[PDB]
Write a protein that binds this ligand. Structure first.
Ligand SMILES: CCCC[P+](CCCC)(CCCC)CCCC
Lengths: 173, 172
């Protein structure tokens, strides 16, 4: 297990999407889970559930795509958390921006206080906070704080929880 | 100048990515300024620079893709037909989290001062800020502020400006 951020940049949209197609084919081949986002001339690809040697191989693939499609490539790695696979995600919603950003400040100081690392995204009236590397007891407290901020600033809250880092997709036919 | 947000949801990743391919082909076929983001089983497609009648047509296309690939579809719409928009993306990088978040606060204070709307994303050592609703003179000012913040907090900065169709990238 490990995370990897790969960034493709190029002015040719078609070549960029050809590189995407191949990169995520390689990642999925090594049992990677890919997240990606295309905006303008930039393509960002987040690959999770991949150990060290797999990341080394995917890096090789990224370097090869750089030559084949004439694009710029940069990649970054966690790189190696000692212990990991303990995740929580919180979503705040409200029409008051000022209150939302107060909630953000309190939640991430709290999360960092319990030695958790945060990622957050504010867009419109929706604020998303992702907290990783956080065990069961900590999530219980962070949930309390979420409920505290919920009541205090009169905003909406919802949660999604990952505990095993094993992801199950169900298909019905 | 109106925009549009289309969201695809489905359990079949391959079918989901087929729907994406067809949707953005249609979106690009018209006016079509396309941005998209895939995460888990949810796919978000953001379309800008599309007038009233085009957005109506793209909605029909999405409903058709729903039937063809057996996926869930929801979409939201905004507009319409204006000169501004005028979009700005700024990127801060640095090893000092406290300094990054200080730069964030100053940057969004300025943008909101000039009646601009901000969206931002912090992950690891990278901070990205999308600023909308800001005309050319304002973007030049926000660009100066970005360069000022570079020196003060000792962080890496680059900004890009999109008006069309035409997008300008500035590197430091
Ligand atoms: C590496 C994927 C990042 C996707 P975004 C942030 C989501 C975080 C969970 C891009 C941030 C804009 C500033 C979602 C925007 C795409 C429509």
């Amino acid at each position: 297990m490990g995370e990897m951020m790969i960034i493709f940049e190029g002015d040719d949209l078609e070549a960029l999407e050809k590189a995407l197609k191949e990169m995520i084919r390689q990642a999925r081949k090594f049992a990677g889970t890919v997240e990606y986002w295309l905006s303008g001339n930039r393509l960002m690809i987040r690959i999770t559930g991949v150990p060290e040697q797999v990341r080394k191989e995917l890096a090789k693939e990224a370097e090869r795509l750089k030559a084949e499609f004439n694009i710029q490539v940069e990649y970054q790695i966690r790189g190696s958390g000692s212990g990991s696979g303990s995740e929580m995600m919180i979503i705040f919603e409200g029409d008051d921006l000022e209150a939302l950003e107060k909630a953000l400040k309190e939640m991430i100081r709290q999360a960092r206080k319990f030695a958790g690392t945060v990622e957050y995204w504010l867009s419109g009236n929706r604020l998303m906070i992702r907290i990783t590397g956080v065990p069961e007891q900590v999530r219980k407290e962070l949930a309390k704080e979420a409920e505290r901020l919920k009541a205090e600033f009169n905003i909406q809250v919802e949660y999604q929880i990952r505990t095993g880092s094993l992801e199950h997709h169900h298909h019905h036919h």
